[PDB]
Amino acid sequence: EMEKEFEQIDKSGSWAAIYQDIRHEASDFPCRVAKLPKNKNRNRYRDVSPFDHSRIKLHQEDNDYINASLIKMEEAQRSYILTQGPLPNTCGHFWEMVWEQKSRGVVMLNRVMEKGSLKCAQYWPQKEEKEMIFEDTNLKLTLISEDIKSAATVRQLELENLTTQETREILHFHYTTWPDFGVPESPASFLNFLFKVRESGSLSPEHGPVVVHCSAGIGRSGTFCLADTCLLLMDKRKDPSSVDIKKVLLEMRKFRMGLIQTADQLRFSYLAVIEGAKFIMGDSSVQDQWKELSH
Ligand SMILES: O=C(O)C(=O)Nc1sc2c(c1C(=O)O)CCNC2
Ligand SMILES: [Cl-]
Ligand SMILES: [Cl-]
Ligand SMILES: [Cl-]
Ligand SMILES: [Cl-]
């Protein structure tokens, strides 16, 4: 069981050693496009790059590069796009990717300002009457409505292709209480947010992959996607013991480097899957519990 391995690792203080073993065994694939000098200002961090084989290509012949990776989980049959927090010059690229990939939801796990620094550009409008037009990619973005709660904020956005005048509704899920290089306040808070994303239908295979980002698109984003995939794999087999989290994380790291950035984030993802398992196996009352101590 996950639970017995957790107790063994905790009793033996092995999380830092377990986590380093994952870093050592993780896939190493080339990132030549990301390292091209013409793409230097499209990367937020020089040590965070998408692999060539899984990177999302923009559908422009100018420069198709965005720091974004397609995580295609074959057995779980769920895909995610993990990307960095957009830069002041890549906000148009970001929404171009959302359009071209037909994404229904965007999951944001960071704040714009964290630890006195700007970890993400203000890539969505904060006021209904002040829409954003991204001239380089010819898209218009309008805040439709906003539902703010203690731990998370859900926004409805309208994305319009100004070339064709098509409009789409994008759901923006913003978890606002997850420190950079840290963990959420509780598993219950994290799981309450995750199931809000699930219930929205944004993860449905009828849509394009959900776009998930933090500042770099690996740390908090990797924790979020690992827990969702492990809970989904449990769901398909209705069998918690068939899910090996370390192997799932290593499978995900074939598609983007550095997913989950600290040993405590790995420990928390165990906690989230173990606690979320109670819902997957048929105890739906655990959901209102999460909302009850999500306050
Ligand atoms: O936002 C996250 O959860 C995340 O992965 N952040 C990361 S990963 C990462 C950095 C940061 C950062 O935000 O400073 C700095 C350079 N090395 C890798
Ligand atoms: Cl490389
Ligand atoms: Cl913010
Ligand atoms: Cl700050
Ligand atoms: Cl920025």
- Residue 135, classed as helix, strand or coil, is coil
Helix or strand holding residue 190 (H, E) = helix 187-199
For ligand 1, atom 10: residue with the closest CA = 216
In DSSP notation, 167-182 reads EEEEEEEEE----TTS
- According to DSSP, the residues that pair with 142 across neighbouring strands are 158
Residue positions forming the annotated binding site for substrate: 180, 214-220, 261
Give the contacts of 100 (CB within 8 A, at least 6 positions apart).
58, 59
Q: Quick one: which of 165, 148, 168, 146 has its CA closest to 156? A: 146
- Ligand 2 being an ion, which residues bring their Cβ within 5 A of it? 30-31
- According to DSSP, the residues that pair with 78 across neighbouring strands are 73
Tell me, yes or no, if 214 is annotated catalytic.
Answer: yes
DSSP β-ladder status, 78-83 and 167-175: unpaired
> Mutate which of 69, 114, 261, 268 to test ligand 1's pocket (most atoms within 8 Å of Cβ)?
261
Q: How far apart are the first and last CA of the chain?
A: 31
Q: How far is the CA of 219 from the centre of ligand 4 (A)?
A: 18
Q: How far is the CA of 182 from the centre of ligand 3 (A)?
A: 16
Tokens 């009850």 — which residue?
A: 292
> Does 218 sit in the ligand 1 pocket, CB within 6 Å?
yes
Experimental technique used? X-ray
> Mutate which of 120, 181, 190 to test ligand 1's pocket (most atoms within 8 Å of Cβ)?
181
Q: Are 105 and 228 in contact (CB under 8 A)?
A: no
> Does 83 sit in the ligand 1 pocket, CB within 6 Å?
no
Q: Is domain 1-295 given the CATH code 3.90.190.10 in the classification? A: yes
Both tokens assigned to 270: 């165990």
Instruction: Name the residue type at position 179.
Output: P
Cα gap 113→145, rounded to integer Å = 22
Cα gap 267→272, rounded to integer Å = 9
Instruction: Name the residue type at position 249.
Output: L
Please classify residue 81 by burial: count the beta carbons closer than 10 Å to its beta carbon, then call 0-12 exposed, 13-18 middle and 19+ buried: buried
Domain boundaries, the chain: 1-295
DSSP β-ladder status, 152-161 and 105-108: unpaired
Cα gap 217→212, rounded to integer Å = 7
Both tokens assigned to 94: 């970001």
Q: How far is the CA of 30 from the centre of ligand 2 (A)?
A: 4
CA 181 to ligand 1: nearest atom: 3
CA 48 to ligand 1: nearest atom: 18
For ligand 1, atom 2: residue with the closest CA = 219
Which ligand has an atom closest to residue 220 CA? Answer: 1
- Sign, Cα dihedral of 9, 247, 221, 215: positive
Q: Are 161 and 102 in contact (CB under 8 A)?
A: no
What ranges in 129-252 are assigned the alpha helix state H?
A: 187-199, 219-237, 245-252
Cα gap 210→172, rounded to integer Å = 10
CA 47 to ligand 1: nearest atom: 17
Q: How far is the CA of 158 from the centre of ligand 1 (A)?
A: 29
Please classify residue 61 by burial: count the beta carbons closer than 10 Å to its beta carbon, then call 0-12 exposed, 13-18 middle and 19+ buried: exposed
Q: Which of 31, 91, 120, 214 is catalytic?
A: 214
CA 85 to ligand 1: nearest atom: 1
Q: Are 123 and 137 in contact (CB under 8 A)?
A: no
- Show the CA angle centred on residue 95, arms to residues 162 and 157, nearest 5°: 80
